[PDB]
Design a protein around this ligand. Structure first.
Ligand SMILES: NC(=O)c1ccc[n+]([C@@H]2O[C@H](COP(=O)([O-])OP(=O)(O)OC[C@H]3O[C@@H](n4cnc5c(N)ncnc54)[C@H](O)[C@@H]3O)[C@@H](O)[C@H]2O)c1
Ligand SMILES: NC(=O)c1ccc[n+]([C@@H]2O[C@H](COP(=O)([O-])OP(=O)(O)OC[C@H]3O[C@@H](n4cnc5c(N)ncnc54)[C@H](O)[C@@H]3O)[C@@H](O)[C@H]2O)c1
Ligand SMILES: NC(=O)c1ccc[n+]([C@@H]2O[C@H](COP(=O)([O-])OP(=O)(O)OC[C@H]3O[C@@H](n4cnc5c(N)ncnc54)[C@H](O)[C@@H]3O)[C@@H](O)[C@H]2O)c1
Ligand SMILES: NC(=O)c1ccc[n+]([C@@H]2O[C@H](COP(=O)([O-])OP(=O)(O)OC[C@H]3O[C@@H](n4cnc5c(N)ncnc54)[C@H](O)[C@@H]3O)[C@@H](O)[C@H]2O)c1
Ligand SMILES: Cc1cc(N)n(Cc2ccc(C(=O)NCc3ccc(F)cc3Cl)cc2)n1
Ligand SMILES: Cc1cc(N)n(Cc2ccc(C(=O)NCc3ccc(F)cc3Cl)cc2)n1
Ligand SMILES: Cc1cc(N)n(Cc2ccc(C(=O)NCc3ccc(F)cc3Cl)cc2)n1
Ligand SMILES: Cc1cc(N)n(Cc2ccc(C(=O)NCc3ccc(F)cc3Cl)cc2)n1
Lengths: 268, 268, 268, 268
């Protein structure tokens, strides 16, 4: 009797076992969901990592910048879940922004080619994925994407913040399309999490100053959050995504759910 | 098993079987929650209406404008749930605005005495209730209040909209306090529901013009909502409240969850 | 030729020469406006302060909690500006919240009588003033009120923040009424300024902690503001109010203009 | 004494005498500003259009997608205004979205190459322009961009709405940079105006359905706006831009000023 008992859910974006998608996949499986996983580029590492999940799940290659992978996606998914079966949920946990547009590099020094790559992957692909999977989604279904609140500017996140603003707008339009299928589309706006790029920044990959800025932001986050914020725990975010994948938020669409300890509602 | 299995939840605001609180109580009971109910003024009719719920629940009198009722509340609740037991959830589903500040009456013609009564009941009582019940709430607990999106002005709702703007602010401060107890505080912003005052307005209690305004509002709500909006169905709102009472939104506090069909995200 | 050349403007809220209203009145007079001033309680004291303004202006008593003062207001204003003449602008720079709802006192310890008084004066009176003066306002006219951003909760401001949330909602409804007269209604959301109450708090009136809280908030405000913030200079706020009183923002109504150094747009 | 008397302002984005930039340029010149104009692609035509302005102004070529144009921009501007002189204001009134991302074309059918072109021109170029002109801007200066409220999804505007969401984020970061120079950066969110593309859609260029959708959007805009909205009058928008270019909004940065008749503050 799990929250997602007998639901067929596609989960994208696992790279390491600290990926927000890894935790979403683990909680979904714990709550009775049957998963299809998608991975990018390093499918060998991804397979080794997905083998650690509580249950076996098919892993499919998906480069959201590749038109062939998107055109074949629904077919490859149907083959994995069985003919006659459709998805009940889709998790978009894909995001990237080159070093030139996120970190220490001046906001004015990011080349458009880099910004465009970041927007393609982090924002446009949310619509690309919905276009590919809505035809194989069941009514009452749910599409969830990952957001980082871009309503206020901040140090370091620069063009990744700009990409999240674009993602928020995309989600509102994806909801209009998803609604025709009786499917909801929402974003979970998470507080900062120590994933691959974040452990690299804090670790000094982009220099001391960038590392410091991130740590200061993580500190302020926990201060402002009335229930606190642990940047090392992705489980509260994973649980929130599963809530949206469930039938317990049935009148919420084109929306943003904040899993950030309540930090965005507090000034100081 | 049930979503709220073994949770002790206080549910305020049942007046008829159309009340949003009646549906919250029913869904909570369906999901394994042990309830304590509070009612105002006409307790014998409230008892006759709470008798229609799937399970028996103690009914306690609570006039949020009465200081004695608030000062004795925690003691009376403890007596009902048993010594040594605490609440895991609190539902504030209380709202009122006199006819002079809600309906057809010009916005400029509402006397402050009437506006103050509406703000006391609809907004201030959210803090009053939290103050009384937080000392008897368990960590991981949840306080949920009912909101009606006041970010844009609209016909008829007038001072009730003003009261909801005040309630939104109260929630953000109640979260600061509830956080000290490891308790979350949130509002569910529902779409229009045909409850007591709503069916009276539409039915022509305040005249034809007011009735027509509400109906035109309801129609536009359903149009804008990508998944539609049934103003006769409180169950999607009830399910959203239960989601917040559950452990599936554990990093959300001082916030607003929209159970409105996604109408507020769409211009037209 | 001034920005407000030949405009008849009513300015409320001067108590000292530190008052935001005193600076609004001074800049308006510098820009060619003809003023009518309103004051509360100690009118012989206010008259000594208004005597410091660049030009002579009639001073009229107005306690916004007094129904007789409001009912006679338009008549008393017309008598001061001359029969046949109407106001082109109205400045609401009135705000109060008792110590129990603003300062160090716990948020839960503010009695409703005190909260209601602050909401009556700081929020409801904005509508009261519009009701009284719109019949004696010229098309193209402007009503400006003073706001302090309540969108995120913060230390110390407590129920005054709740009152500002209610004021923001009142402004949106006053704009609906003002539109019938071809009059705009807007709020200027100012950053913290050292006025009577703020100076008293910083000086230790509510104790050492309350003092320290205001200063930390002031410090962070200047940090977040990309152009800085000086809590001792009300002139940038006064200039913004005059911009709204002018014909240079003619398609802005039911809105909020932030004169806060851009702090509310920055997280850190 | 003009509102911008003795100010040196760069105005981009004139294509026809219907362009919002044409009206901004006209009002600025009426208010004593000395202008430098930038145009894209058809310079011979733009020159004939700029010749209808109240005063002569140098016209410079600027394709925001061309890196040579941006690298030489400040030098070419300095040559036009005279050595030793700097700009006091910059107007970004540049926007474009291919037919595939704006109109009747399904939201999911816009190729990323087209979306990327639209985001480059409508959003990224705001930062590009600031990067190029901030070194030749005087303290107290102002950068103004043109926005179309993207906070709610709507018919037809599709990916142009997505680009405006990105622009709003770019503005907040441009403000951080501009602040180092004592320069403000803001957006004017205008209501729908009958400029080149808007006349073409309404006129049936993309078919009847698209034409009808814009007209129902225009109708609802006027209805919602408490002071009405005339989609044929760009002067109220032009006046708002000039207000921001002036010294009358000196504590406003990273922000959005709505010149939309107040429509965004009203639901119905
Ligand atoms: N960690 C945070 O602070 C934080 C906060 C809010 C939101 N997010 C968002 O959460 C999501 C997941 O990020 P994360 O923090 O778990 O980091 P992560 O590095 O573990 O995950 C990002 C994933 O994106 C995938 N990806 C990148 N380019 C791709 C492409 N072309 N095609 C397909 N997949 C591609 C990667 O393979 C990786 O699995 C992202 O959208 C991120 O922006 C992160
Ligand atoms: N129905 C809608 O359109 C709608 C939309 C959004 C939010 N809401 C909110 O949902 C909540 C429930 O309202 P409803 O629509 O179910 O209608 P309702 O008439 O059934 O409920 C209002 C409740 O408030 C109680 N109440 C009034 N004064 C009280 C007092 N002094 N002390 C204690 N209780 C008091 C009443 O007894 C009643 O049970 C309210 O907060 C309302 O504002 C309603
Ligand atoms: N100082 C700040 O940091 C700050 C920031 C944002 C907004 N504001 C707002 O600016 C406005 C003016 O405040 P200020 O900071 O200049 O303080 P202030 O003390 O100088 O002025 C407040 C004024 O309200 C008047 N007033 C109080 N009760 C009244 C009543 N019953 N009838 C009529 N007038 C009454 C007082 O006499 C006084 O002139 C208020 O609305 C305040 O909330 C202040
Ligand atoms: N018309 C509306 O309904 C409306 C509403 C709100 C905001 N806006 C915004 O106002 C601004 C002005 O648009 P408009 O409505 O006056 O239309 P317009 O067609 O007259 O102006 C847009 C301008 O963009 C220029 N442009 C396009 N590609 C360019 C490039 N690569 N380099 C340089 N310039 C380039 C064109 O030459 C043109 O002058 C835009 O940013 C637009 O999005 C328009
Ligand atoms: C809001 C948010 C937080 C996180 N982690 N994401 C997703 C994300 C972002 C950026 C990259 C990435 O690797 N970027 C290039 C890079 C390489 C090395 C380095 F030390 C820093 C950088 Cl920025 C990967 C994933 N989104
Ligand atoms: C946003 C919203 C919608 C609803 N229903 N609520 C709660 C609510 C509001 C008002 C009253 C009420 O009875 N008001 C007095 C009245 C009596 C008879 C009449 F026909 C109209 C009126 Cl306004 C009760 C409950 N909140
Ligand atoms: C947001 C904002 C900031 C300011 N200054 N205002 C207006 C305002 C608020 C409060 C009072 C007031 O006198 N309050 C009682 C009091 C008296 C003495 C004392 F030291 C502290 C207190 Cl709180 C007066 C004016 N609004
Ligand atoms: C929000 C907003 C409104 C307006 N007018 N702008 C600026 C803008 C947008 C689009 C284009 C454009 O020409 N797009 C390609 C096209 C050509 C012909 C056609 F009939 C329709 C289309 Cl979409 C030009 C300028 N931004």
């Amino acid at each position: 009797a799990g929250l997602l008992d007998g639901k067929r859910i596609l989960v994208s974006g696992i790279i390491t076992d600290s990926s927000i998608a890894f935790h979403i996949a683990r909680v979904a499986q714990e709550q009775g969901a049957q998963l299809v996983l998608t991975g990018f580029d390093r499918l060998r590492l991804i397979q080794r990592i997905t083998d650690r999940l509580p249950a076996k799940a098919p892993l499919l290659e998906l480069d959201v910048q590749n038109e062939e992978h998107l055109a074949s996606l629904a077919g490859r998914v149907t083959e994995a879940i069985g003919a006659g079966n459709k998805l009940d949920g889709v998790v978009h946990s894909i995001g990237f922004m080159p070093q030139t547009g996120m970190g220490i590099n001046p906001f004015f020094d990011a080349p458009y080619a880099d910004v465009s790559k970041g927007i393609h992957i982090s924002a446009y692909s949310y619509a690309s994925m919905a276009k590919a999977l809505l035809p194989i989604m069941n009514p009452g279904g749910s599409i969830v994407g990952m957001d980082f609140d871009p309503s206020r500017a901040m140090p370091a996140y620069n063009w990744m913040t700009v990409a999240k603003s674009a993602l928020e707008s995309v989600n509102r339009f994806v909801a209009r399309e998803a609604g025709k299928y009786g499917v909801r589309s929402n974003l979970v706006a998470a507080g900062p999490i120590r994933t691959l790029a974040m452990s690299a920044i804090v670790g000094g990959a982009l220099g001391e100053e960038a590392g410091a800025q991130i740590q200061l932001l993580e500190e302020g986050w926990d201060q402002r959050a009335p229930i606190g914020w642990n940047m090392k725990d992705a489980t509260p975010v994973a649980k929130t995504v599963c809530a949206l994948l469930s039938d317990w938020l049935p009148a919420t669409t084109g929306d943003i759910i904040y899993a950030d300890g309540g930090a965005h509602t507090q000034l100081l």
